[PDB]
Design a protein around this ligand. Structure first.
Ligand SMILES: Nc1ncnc2c1ncn2[C@@H]1O[C@H](COP(=O)(O)OP(=O)(O)OP(=O)(O)O)[C@@H](O)[C@H]1O
Ligand SMILES: Nc1ncnc2c1ncn2[C@@H]1O[C@H](COP(=O)(O)OP(=O)(O)OP(=O)(O)O)[C@@H](O)[C@H]1O
Ligand SMILES: Nc1ncnc2c1ncn2[C@@H]1O[C@H](COP(=O)(O)OP(=O)(O)O)[C@@H](O)[C@H]1O
Ligand SMILES: [Mg+2]
Ligand SMILES: [Mg+2]
Ligand SMILES: [Mg+2]
Lengths: 166, 50, 365, 487, 46, 523
């Protein structure tokens, strides 16, 4: 509709519909970043819709790559993506973006990150999907029953000379 | 060597009217085969010590 | 095989100091080739040249290993068919050699199985070792602040009359004598008497059993020698150590004294070769010459070489290009200061300016 | 051999950025521009500038681009004259290079006239006497070394002392409201710095793409070969000269860094067969700089206010290049690294700065008297500092300590936060009026503010800001006392 | 004062020497790279 | 249908690692700065680079490989093209020469490209975490920045750069490959052994998957040492022009200049200062100008440069050192005295500077760094000229700056925040590292059953990105952050410091000394 212009005043391509379709056809969410890279190279900066689609692919994708990658985390990738969008692109995440993050936290069983995201949605957005809040609490109480509330080695009593400093 | 030289001469358009001449040189770096140089175009069909 | 240039005949065209130009009608031999002067010239000893540059397709510039006295133009020279080769193997143990590999101990013939060229390529990346361990010398300052690494490179930077030679002898007594492996002593531009004293000391300690098996080889090109020899004796001594390291998988000690004279010798010839001097007056190729030499002094997967090199600091100026470039080629650096010695402290090590690579808790306690 | 336009020659030698050209009909005049017409598979055109005549047919030249893919005997065609650059109001708001070609990717520029970059400097009769103070909004400059309109200003400094920052502050304070035009010449500096300047100027509306701009940019930077860096300054200077003469306007000319012009000529001097002089500069250091500097002057037709940044290599002001530039300036601002390390910005050493208009006839008597008193007090304070280190502050007399206490406030009161260094400092900048600065220092000298805490003068503007900071300091101190009292 | 003066007088001597050597090494290079061309004169007329 | 090369002449003279060529009459001729092949055998060629084109027709050649095989009278063929080397993701984890040849271990990019235009760049706004608190706070580094690392021999110049490469391994594994940081480590004139030790060190931490090594050892000719930085950056420009970020490390430019000096003098170039060629500044200048942060219109990729430079006796007045300092956007000065004084890394904050500023810091680090900067400034002056708050916290900040391995962002930022807000005022300076170790690798609240926080715990490594988004001084994270610090401080003082201050036995004293020293090398 309205032409956008870049930092130096040159115009940027705004027709970012085909790229979203490409993102919605990926198998591993690392391939989504490649699409974003191509968009930037083609002077087609991503919009809010593109980032949400990328988050959706991350949540719905099996893994980062065809082969496993050590210490890979969907939550970390999405949070970094949001950091790029808000800070280095000046775009405010909407409710949809945060919901995807909350779904990933619930799905992965990380019930402590869900609490933080829950407050974020209750602070920036308007509340949290009550379905997901209840799901996170169920995961937390399961840990209490099973005793996996904190890593066990932390609970072990230590002393001044009883700590192994690697 | 003469056949290769003629083929190179044909490829070169500048030397269309020039007359082909062959000059033999002895190179101790090659034990077998031969090489042909014409107007900077160099073709190597030679082998040295293994 | 036999070289295609052996027996090639050339004639002397220009003589300036220790630098001689030779013209070959059939073509200049390859660089680093060795040539012998055939004309008698009334000399008392033979004359040998090493090619270092190619002026044209027929002319080549060379450095003489002996004095160029009584050398005339048009003198006849014959190629030897290869680089300067030296004896290798257990036959060399207990013997004294010069830059050319000729025994100067006035004893029986060496009878070596074979010879190998002094100039050789250095070990590649895949042939490097990864073993770090402490060599106990018995000296408090070294063992504490700058511990030495077995199979590593050690440098003793010092001025004139500071104690470089003394420490080397102490290390020899405390390590070499009680060493399972072999040892090579490379004297380069140092006092001739010191070599004689070392030879007597090694015989008394029976590290050289004239009638039995010895564990030490001596290679000496001293101050009196012309610059050409002082620039190649280190290569020959290093070549012998390389053979022991690789062909036998034996641990070797390499005591070089002094390595600075090697760079100084190359500077003297470089001036005559017609090269533009670098800072101070050294040759522009100062770093490259050290790099080629030092990279050969390393421990590979086959064997280990522990090298101890004495470095002379001219005018007590540690910023001189020669010693300055040598720091990067040493695992352990031992800096000696004249003022400390004048205070009665021996050794004169300045610990603040010293360093070591095995000063890592992962290696030492 | 009058008109050499289209004359043909062949490349005879190529060593680095220096190329020898052979002409059968005679080498063109020196400073002539040549184009390499031969197709060498290059991604950029190749142009050369004749600098010397080896004989009646051979000429040595410096290339403006990289000499890659250049072969011997390559054909070369003269352009019929020196290097020409566009001039006029149509260049406003645009970025150019040494050759006068736009590099802003903003479309063709409509040029009605072009002028050679090499021109003869004004003669003695063409000199105008303009003694008027220039208010930069900076306490130190306006007080100790006031600037003069239509004059020449140098910012001598090492690396990292704040030469570039001061230029940005001057632009923000003098160029936004300037009646006339402005020309910025980047010479052998960082390319990113030029980018930041371009963005800032667009934001400040100095360069109005949709409207009317009032500044020109000419960039020859480190990445460029020495040939370009040795002529970019001439190109920008030519643009300013046109605005001065033809348009009769008062123009600003910022240069950063002028030293690179000397450095570039030294790099090529070795290949031109010239024996190096002391330190290692070219023997023609003084003459080449003089010709350029004399062109940067205000004549009877118009006025050029020139601000040039000079790099003092290794903080050695005895170096030939910085020293040679001192005599070609009307106001020198010498920055010191020690001052910066103490947290004082701008890191100006007032004991080494000087100004031509520091005379009662030009400036007000109060201004002259205040500045001299400040300088004398600072000089005395430094001598006392030697005593304070040997004997200690206790041994100083009553008079001496009063000088010490007052002088320390002067040292900290000279500091000022700039509006462009907010990221560096984290505080808003200040613009101090000339009258406020004089009054504030005058009161400080006579002890009107002896009871004010010393730190209240640190990184503030006028006297009013000093009082506010002192009040804030008092309030926080009272809170700390109250907290201690409760404990 | 007697130890820093020597280092000051020793430094100026080195500074002068290094500069002149450095200038005179860039004069040798210019001379060496340059050479006299074929001598076009009436050699027979002698 | 023949593989016809372009013969241009013969080899006339050879002087070490350089050569001269005489052109055969009536031949096409060779172009400047192009690659040529010297036919050492009917099937073997040695690479050379054109450097000079003289009036006589003679050509100056810089040899690159198979030097020993070169002899006078051999034939020379001209490729007619500049130097191009392999580039792509298929080179990562490998050791290569400047010519692209792979070195066994136990797309073509042009090496002479021009730097990005003024309008092709963007302001530096993305941080590059070195992993060291001192650098990340007081000396910010941003992607697309040139940050010199200047110091004396044996001061940590190499270690810090290597640690910076390693610190990206953990980050790259989590975030998308879009924002991953690739590494190009270039070794120039170094020992072959040091390269192998570096290769093993990177492999142990798994950094080879995102890193490649370009080695030109001392034994190699000066030509390779001269081209290594340009080839290394070229490999890094492949990612820059494709919307990705890279980090090029040069170890070190000091030995590159020596190689360039050696080449120029042998080829009859007039010497300059310290015998260096006149155009020695232009060498590094065009090398470091190629490291930039491309604009959104060109992809947004970047190259970060960390050139390393060696001084003598802490003399930064040298020639090449000055030139590099006047080029880079900031300098990290490693001081010998601090290094021997126990401060490691020996970063001299007074002499170090980053011209990018806070723009290269994350929103979380901006607040901590800004306040931290003022405290240290006062701390330096107070001691130079009384347990005031700036002097109490300044010492603890200095103690926290001692490190041996890069620190995760969450651990570092939290510790700095604690020392900033006075949580360490009651902690002795000697015990600060021990306090930090327990905070990071332990949790006193859980140990003593007094932890009531819901999500904020130091063992939840995923909190790093939440912190990097919202800031520590935000309502979401601020409330729980203070509670955790308060509990950790109270528990630490009560259960540990009291016992530590009550130790008098020689055995116990020695045991404590070992513990605290170990804590320095752990966190
Ligand atoms: N460890 C030591 N204990 C006592 N005196 C020492 C010691 N080391 C050196 N000296 C004294 O210093 C003198 C010179 O020592 P040394 O022969 O090692 O010199 P250097 O370093 O080899 O110097 P150069 O070989 O250039 O003469 C000795 O003769 C002795 O008087
Ligand atoms: N942060 C650190 N803490 C403790 N030791 C360190 C640290 N960084 C480096 N070192 C050690 O200091 C020594 C020198 O480090 P490094 O190899 O990085 O030096 P350098 O600057 O590369 O010097 P050069 O390359 O000239 O030898 C090594 O033993 C290394 O393990
Ligand atoms: N007004 C200022 N306030 C604070 N720091 C400053 C100021 N001016 C300069 N600096 C310091 O100097 C750096 C900028 O240096 P710069 O202006 O480029 O100097 P130069 O061009 O002389 O090297 C800043 O990053 C900061 O560290
Ligand atoms: Mg001795
Ligand atoms: Mg600047
Ligand atoms: Mg290093």
């Amino acid at each position: 509709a309205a032409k956008k212009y870049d930092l130096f005043g040159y115009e940027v391509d705004t027709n970012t519909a085909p790229w979203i379709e490409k993102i919605k056809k990926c198998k591993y969410y690392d391939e989504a970043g490649e699409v974003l890279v191509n968009m930037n190279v083609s002077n087609c900066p991503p919009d809010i819709a593109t980032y949400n689609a990328t988050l959706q692919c991350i949540y719905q994708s099996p893994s980062k790559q065809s082969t496993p990658v050590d210490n890979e985390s969907k939550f970390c990738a999405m949070m970094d993506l949001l950091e790029e969008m808000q800070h280095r692109n000046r775009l405010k995440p909407n409710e949809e973006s945060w919901t995807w993050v909350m779904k990933e936290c619930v799905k992965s069983g990380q019930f402590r990150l869900g609490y933080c995201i829950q407050q974020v949605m209750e602070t920036e957005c308007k509340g949290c999907p009550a379905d997901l809040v209840k799901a996170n609490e169920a995961n937390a109480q399961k840990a209490k029953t099973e005793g996996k509330e904190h890593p066990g080695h932390l609970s072990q009593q230590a002393g001044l000379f009883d700590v192994k400093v690697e | 060597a003469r056949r290769v030289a003629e083929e190179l001469h044909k490829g070169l358009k500048e030397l269309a009217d020039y007359t082909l001449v062959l000059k033999t040189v002895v190179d101790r770096t090659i034990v077998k085969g031969f090489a042909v140089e014409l107007a900077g175009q160099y073709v190597n069909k030679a082998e040295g010590q293994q | 095989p036999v070289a295609d240039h052996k027996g090639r005949v050339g004639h002397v065209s220009q003589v300036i100091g220790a630098v001689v130009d030779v013209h070959f009608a059939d073509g200049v031999p390859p660089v680093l080739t060795a040539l012998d002067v055939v004309d008698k010239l009334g000399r008392d000893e033979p004359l040998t040249l090493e090619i270092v540059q190619h002026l044209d397709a027929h002319t080549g510039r060379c450095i003489a290993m002996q004095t160029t006295d009584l050398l005339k133009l048009k003198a006849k020279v014959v190629s030897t068919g290869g680089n300067i080769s030296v004896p290798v193997g257990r036959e060399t143990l207990g013997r004294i050699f010069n830059v050319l590999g000729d025994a100067i101990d006035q004893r029986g013939p060496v009878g070596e199985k074979l010879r190998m060229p002094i100039h050789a390529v250095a070990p590649k990346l895949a042939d490097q070792a990864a073993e770090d361990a402490v060599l106990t010398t018995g000296i408090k300052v070294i063992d504490l602040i700058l511990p030495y690494c077995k199979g590593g490179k050690i440098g003793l930077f010092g001025g004139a009359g500071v104690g470089k030679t003394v420490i080397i002898m102490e290390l020899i007594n405390n390590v070499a004598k009680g060493h399972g492996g072999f040892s090579v002593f490379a004297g380069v531009g140092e006092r001739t008497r010191e070599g004689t004293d070392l030879y007597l000391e090694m015989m008394q300690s029976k590290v050289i059993d004239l009638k039995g098996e010895s564990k030490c080889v001596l290679v000496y090109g001293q101050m009196n020698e012309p610059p050409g020899a002082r620039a190649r004796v280190a290569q020959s001594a290093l070549t012998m150590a390389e053979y022991f390291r690789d062909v036998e998988g034996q641990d070797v000690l390499l005591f070089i004294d002094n390595i600075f004279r090697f760079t100084q010798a190359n500077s003297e010839v470089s001036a005559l070769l017609g090269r533009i001097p670098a800072a101070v007056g050294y040759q522009p190729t100062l770093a490259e010459d050290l790099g080629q030499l030092q990279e050969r002094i390393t421990s590979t997967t086959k064997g280990s070489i522990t090298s101890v090199q004495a470095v002379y600091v001219p005018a007590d100026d540690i910023t001189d290009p020669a010693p300055a470039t040598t720091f990067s080629h040493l695992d352990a650096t031992t800096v000696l200061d004249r003022a400390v010695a004048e205070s009665g402290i021996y050794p004169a090590v300045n610990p603040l300016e010293c360093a070591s690579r095995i000063m890592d808790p992962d290696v030492i306690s | 051999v009058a008109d050499h336009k289209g004359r043909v020659g062949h490349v005879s030698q190529v060593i680095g950025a220096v190329v020898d050209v052979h002409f059968a009909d005679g080498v063109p005049p020196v400073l002539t521009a040549l184009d390499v017409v031969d197709k060498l598979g290059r991604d950029e055109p190749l142009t050369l500038e004749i600098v010397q005549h080896l004989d009646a047919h051979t000429g040595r030249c410096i290339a403006m681009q990289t000499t890659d893919l250049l072969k011997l005997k390559a054909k070369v065609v003269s352009t019929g004259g020196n290097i020409s650059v566009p001039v006029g109001r149509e260049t406003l708001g645009r970025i150019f290079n040494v050759l006068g070609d736009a590099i802003d990717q903003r479309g063709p520029v409509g040029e009605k006239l072009r002028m050679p970059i090499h021109a003869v400097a004004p003669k003695l009769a063409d000199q105008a006497a303009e003694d008027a103070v220039l208010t930069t909004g900076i306490k130190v400059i306006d007080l100790i070394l006031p600037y003069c309109k239509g004059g020449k200003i140098g910012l001598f400094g090492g690396a990292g002392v704040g030469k570039t920052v001061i230029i940005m502050e001057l632009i923000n304070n003098v160029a936004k409201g300037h009646g006339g035009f402005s020309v910025f010449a980047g010479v052998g500096e960082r390319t990113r710095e030029g980018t930041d300047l371009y963005l800032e100027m667009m934001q400040s509306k100095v360069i109005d793409l949709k409207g009317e701009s009032k500044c020109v940019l000419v960039y020859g930077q480190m990445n460029e070969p020495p040939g370009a860096r040795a002529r970019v300054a001439q190109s920008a200077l030519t643009m300013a000269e046109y605005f001065r003469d033809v348009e009769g306007q008062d123009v600003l000319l910022f240069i950063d860094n002028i030293f690179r012009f000397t450095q570039a000529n030294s790099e090529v001097s070795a290949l031109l067969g010239r024996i190096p002089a002391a330190v290692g500069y070219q023997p023609t250091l003084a003459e080449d700089l003089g010709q350029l500097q004399e062109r940067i002057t205000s004549t009877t037709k118009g006025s050029i206010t020139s601000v040039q940044a000079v790099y003092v290599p290794a903080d050695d002001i005895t170096d030939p290049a910085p020293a040679t530039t001192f005599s070609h300036l009307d106001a020198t601002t010498v920055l010191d690294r020690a001052v910066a390390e103490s947290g004082i910005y701008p890191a100006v050493n007032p004991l080494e700065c000087a100004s031509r208009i520091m005379d009662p006839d030009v400036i007000s008597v109060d201004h002259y008297n205040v500045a001299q008193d400040v300088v004398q007090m600072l000089t005395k304070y430094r001598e006392l500092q030697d005593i304070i280190a040997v004997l200690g502050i206790d041994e100083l007399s009553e008079e001496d300590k009063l000088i010490v206490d007052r002088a320390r406030k002067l040292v900290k009161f000279l500091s000022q936060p700039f509006q462009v260094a907010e990221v560096f400092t984290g505080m808003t900048g200040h613009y101090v009026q000339l009258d406020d600065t004089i009054d504030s220092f005058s009161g400080l000298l006579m002890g009107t503010y002896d009871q004010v805490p010393e730190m209240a003068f640190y990184m503030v503007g006028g006297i009013n800001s000093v009082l506010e900071k002192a009040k804030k300091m008092a309030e926080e101190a009272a809170e700390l006392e109250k907290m201690r009292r409760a404990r | 004062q007697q130890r820093t003066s020597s280092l000051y007088n020793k430094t100026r001597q080195f500074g002068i020497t290094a500069a002149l050597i450095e200038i005179l090494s860039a004069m040798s290079s210019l001379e060496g790279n340059a050479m006299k061309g074929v001598r076009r004169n009436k050699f027979w007329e002698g | 249908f023949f593989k016809t090369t372009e013969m241009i002449g013969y080899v006339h003279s050879i002087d070490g690692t350089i050569a001269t060529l005489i052109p055969a009459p009536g031949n096409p001729g060779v172009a400047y700065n192009t690659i040529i092949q010297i036919q050492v055998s009917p099937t073997t060629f040695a690479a050379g680079l054109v450097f000079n084109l003289e009036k006589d027709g003679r050509i100056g050649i810089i040899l690159m490989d198979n030097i020993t095989e070169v002899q006078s009278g051999q034939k020379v063929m001209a490729t007619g093209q500049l130097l191009h080397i392999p580039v792509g993701a298929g080179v990562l984890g490998k050791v290569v020469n400047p010519l692209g040849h792979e070195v066994p271990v136990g797309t073509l990019g042009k090496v002479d490209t021009g730097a990005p235009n003024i309008v092709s760049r963007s302001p530096v706004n993305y941080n590059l975490l070195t992993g060291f608190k001192a650098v990340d706070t007081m000396i910010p580094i941003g992607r697309g920045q040139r940050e010199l690392i200047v110091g004396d021999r044996q001061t940590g110049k190499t270690s810090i750069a290597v640690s910076t490469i390693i610190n990206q391994v953990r980050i790259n594994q989590q975030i998308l490959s879009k924002n991953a940081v690739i590494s190009i480590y270039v070794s120039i004139g170094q020992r072959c052994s040091n390269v192998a030790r570096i290769h093993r060190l990177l492999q142990s931490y798994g950094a080879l998957r995102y890193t490649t090594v370009m080695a030109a050892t001392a034994a190699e000719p000066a030509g390779l040492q001269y081209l290594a930085p340009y080839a290394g950056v070229t490999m890094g420009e492949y990612f820059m022009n494709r919307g990705r970020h890279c980090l090029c490390v040069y170890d070190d430019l000091s030995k590159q200049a020596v190689a360039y000096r050696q080449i120029s003098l042998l080829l009859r170039r007039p010497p300059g200062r310290e015998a260096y060629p006149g155009d020695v500044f232009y060498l590094h200048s065009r090398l470091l100008e190629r490291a930039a942060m491309l604009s959104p219109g060109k992809g947004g990729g970047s190259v970060t440069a960390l050139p390393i430079v060696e001084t003598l006796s802490n003399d930064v007045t040298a020639y090449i050192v000055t030139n590099v300092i006047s080029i880079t956007d900031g300098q990290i000065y490693l001081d010998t005295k601090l290094f021997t004084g126990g401060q490691r890394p020996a970063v001299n904050i007074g002499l170090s500077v980053s011209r990018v500023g806070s723009s290269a810091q994350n929103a979380a680090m901006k607040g901590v760094a800004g306040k931290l900067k003022g405290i240290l400034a006062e701390y330096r002056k107070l001691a130079a000229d009384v347990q005031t708050i700036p002097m109490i916290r300044g010492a603890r900040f200095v103690a926290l700056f001692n490190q041996k391995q890069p620190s995760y962002f969450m651990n570092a930022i939290v510790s700095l925040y604690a020392c900033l807000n006075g949580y360490l005022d009651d902690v002795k300076v000697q015990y600060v590292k021990f306090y930090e170790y327990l905070l990071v690798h332990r949790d006193l609240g859980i140990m003593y059953g007094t932890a009531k926080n819901k999500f904020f715990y130091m063992y939840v490594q995923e909190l790093n990105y939440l912190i990097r988004f919202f800031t520590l001084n935000s309502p979401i994270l601020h409330g729980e952050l203070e509670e955790m610090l308060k509990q950790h401080t109270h528990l630490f003082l009560q259960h540990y410091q009291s016992k530590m201050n009550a130790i008098k036995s020689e055995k116990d004293v020695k045991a404590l000394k070992n513990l605290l020293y170990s804590c320095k090398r752990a966190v």
